[PDB]
């Protein structure tokens, strides 16, 4: 379906290039922000302010087709129920980077 084509665009992720890969989360703001107080793990980059959600979450992987091309960005929409990993920073202690989904 077209969910990804729309989302990437309305969230300005297709402005000056086509962001190849992007994950969206279909949970409450409160639920996502809560991960910041869940399972502390290492970030992909070596830092240690990342957290893995205790629960899987309803997400959606957006990945540009091999045939896509700016300014006509095109994505395959893939839905999933998976644990997310985010880097939390600041006060309030909230997500500032999406690290991974497992």
């Amino acid at each position: 379906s077209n969910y990804c084509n729309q989302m990437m665009k309305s969230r300005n992720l297709t402005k000056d290039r086509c962001k190849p890969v992007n994950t969206f989360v279909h949970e409450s703001l409160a639920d996502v922000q809560a991960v910041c107080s869940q399972k502390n793990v290492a970030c992909k980059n070596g830092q240690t302010n990342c957290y893995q959600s205790y629960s899987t979450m309803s997400i959606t992987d957006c990945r540009e087709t091999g045939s896509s091309k700016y300014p006509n960005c095109a994505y395959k929409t893939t839905q999933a129920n998976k644990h997310i990993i985010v880097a939390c920073e600041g006060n309030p202690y909230v997500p500032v980077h999406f690290d991974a989904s497992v």
């Binding site: 300005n12 992720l13 969206f24 703001l29 600041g90 909230v94 997500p95 500032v96």
Partner: peptide, 14 residues
């Protein structure tokens, strides 16, 4: 734009 605000624009679809 803040890092937090960017996270939402990019990954938040509640």
């Amino acid at each position: 734009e803040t890092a937090a605000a960017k996270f939402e624009r990019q990954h938040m679809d509640s």
